[PDB]
Amino acid sequence: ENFNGGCLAGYMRTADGRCKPTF
């Protein structure tokens, strides 16, 4: 389990809520 906002793993939550890449 894991819930850091609601992403897959590594992605970030923009100002839109769209789990984007954190590369």
Side-chain angles (χ1 to χ4, degrees), residues 4-23:
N4 42 293
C7 281
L8 173 43
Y11 296 107
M12 44 147 189
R13 292 266 244 160
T14 43
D16 197 70
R18 306 195 156 274
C19 287
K20 251 155 164 67
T22 313
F23 309 142

